[PDB]
Structure 1
Amino acid sequence: MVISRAEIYWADLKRRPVLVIQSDPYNASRLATVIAAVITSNTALAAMPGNVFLPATTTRLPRDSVVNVTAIVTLNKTDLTDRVGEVPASLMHEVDRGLRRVLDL
């Protein structure tokens, strides 16, 4: 399947949701890996600076979620199973700013 940035997938880390943050050039390349940020259902992590709150109406996920930009994982592209949906441009911009903040970029 086609792996794109800003997309949410289910993956085995247990089975949790992740947001693809690897750029689409590397996603389309022959690179076996894909970098992603973990999405938690514990909304209390939204207080942590840089993390991004995602309503369940936005992600088509069961519950409200939070992108934890301090929890970055490198997965095999094969580990990505069902796709959940996509994060809108505005919230993805918030995620980008959080990532630049936590990574000094």
Structure 2
Amino acid sequence: MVISRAEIYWADLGPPSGSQPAKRRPVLVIQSDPYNASRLATVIAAVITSNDALAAMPGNVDLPATTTRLPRDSVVNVTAIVTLNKTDLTDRVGEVPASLMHEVDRGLRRVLDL
């Protein structure tokens, strides 16, 4: 399938290990489209959580259920970045609007000093 930046998918992030990303959850594709369309086997994504507490962390981005069509109000956790096999992405949810992705972009530059 074709994977595009700003898309939300579900992925199994695997067993917990301390605070690292884990478990089955929605993820937001943040890898750029030329890499997504390339032979690169992987895609980079930010973890999404329904934990309303993380919305208060600087850089994180609120995702209203009415926007995403996810079951619950959720948050993009820009401090939680994973690299997944493209084939790991399942149950495509939709694409986050440009205005919200711009906030994600600003958050990623903040957390990565870019």
TM, length-normalised to structure 1: 0.99
Which of 24, 28, 37 matches 2:37?
A: 28
Aligned-pair Cα RMSD in Å: 0.5
Q: CA deviation at 1:31?
A: 0.2
Q: Does 1:93 align with 2:111?
A: no
SS of 1:61's equivalent in the other structure is coil
Q: CA deviation at 1:86?
A: 1.1
Percentage of pairs with the same residue: 98
Alpha-carbon separation, structure 2, partners of 1:15 and 1:60:
17
Write out per-residue CA displacement over residues 43-100 of structure 1, whole angstroms, 9 at most, x where no aligned residue.
Answer: 1101000000000000000000000000000000000011011111011000000000
SS of 1:72's equivalent in the other structure is strand
Partner of 1:4: 4
Which of 57, 60, 64 matches 2:66?
A: 57
Alpha-carbon separation, structure 1, partners of 2:94 and 2:82:
19
Q: CA deviation at 1:27?
A: 0.1
Alpha-carbon separation, structure 1, partners of 2:99 and 2:35:
23
Alpha-carbon separation, structure 2, partners of 1:45 and 1:81:
24
Superposition misfits of 4+ residues, deviation over 2 angstroms: none
Alpha-carbon separation, structure 2, partners of 1:72 and 1:88:
20
User: Structure 1, unaligned stretches of length 5 or more?
Assistant: none
TM, length-normalised to structure 2: 0.91
SS of 2:58's equivalent in the other structure is coil
Q: CA deviation at 1:15?
A: 1.2
Write out per-residue CA displacement over residues 17-39 of structure 1, whole angstroms, 9 at most, x where no aligned residue.
Answer: 00000000000000001000000
Alpha-carbon separation, structure 2, partners of 1:82 and 1:64:
18
SS of 1:96's equivalent in the other structure is helix
User: Structure 2, unaligned stretches of length 5 or more?
Assistant: 14-22
Alpha-carbon separation, structure 1, partners of 2:9 and 2:90:
7
Q: In the comparison of the two structures, how many residue pairs are matched?
A: 105
